[PDB]
């Protein structure tokens, strides 16, 4: 309908893809950090 | 070409650069690196960064 904004840039637990999401004043902050956790 | 100056409740992410600077230790001058100012010596110091 609309595209009001856009942007373009063993298996034993090789890494972790964790992301926290929060919002302030409408502006939105993505947080990403692919920590290697083999445990 | 239209340039819209909407300073609404959403944050302002539209600013612009000017000029150049080169400041060395043993002197004492101002500074402005995207907003923060201050008066003093600007030493190419031995500190860490990330």
UniProtKB/Swiss-Prot annotation, chain B:
Effect of residue 37 to K: In strain: Omicron/BA.1
Renumbered residue ranges of the record's region Disordered: 9-31
Function in brief: Attaches the virion to the cell membrane by interacting with host receptor, initiating the infection. The major receptor is host ACE2. When S2/S2' has been cleaved, binding to the receptor triggers direct fusion at the cell membrane. When S2/S2' has not been cleaved, binding to the receptor results in internalization of the virus by endocytosis using host TFRC and GRM2 and leading to fusion of the virion membrane with the host endosomal membrane. Alternatively, may use NRP1/NRP2 and integrin as entry receptors.
Assembly behavior: Binds to host ACE2. RBD also interacts with the N-linked glycan on 'Asn-90' of ACE2. Cleavage of S generates a polybasic C-terminal sequence on S1 that binds to host Neuropilin-1 (NRP1) and Neuropilin-2 (NRP2) receptors. Interacts with host integrin alpha-5/beta-1 (ITGA5:ITGB1) and with ACE2 in complex with integrin alpha-5/beta-1 (ITGA5:ITGB1). May interact via cytoplasmic c-terminus with M protein. May interact (via N-terminus) with host bilirubin and biliverdin, thereby preventing antibody binding to the SARS-CoV-2 spike NTD via an allosteric mechanism.
The name this protein goes by in its record: Spike protein S1
UniProt organism field: Severe acute respiratory syndrome coronavirus 2
Organism lineage: Viruses, Riboviria, Orthornavirae, Pisuviricota, Pisoniviricetes
GN (gene name): S
């Amino acid at each position: 309908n609309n595209c009001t904004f856009e942007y373009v840039s063993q298996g034993n637990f090789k890494n972790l893809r964790e992301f926290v999401f929060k919002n302030i004043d409408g502006y939105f902050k993505i947080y990403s950090k692919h920590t290697p956790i083999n445990l | 070409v239209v340039l819209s100056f909407e300073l609404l409740h959403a944050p302002a992410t539209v600013c612009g650069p000017k000029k150049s600077t080169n400041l060395v230790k043993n002197k004492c001058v101002n500074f402005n690196f995207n907003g923060l100012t201050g008066t003093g010596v600007l030493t190419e110091s031995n500190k860490k960064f990330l």
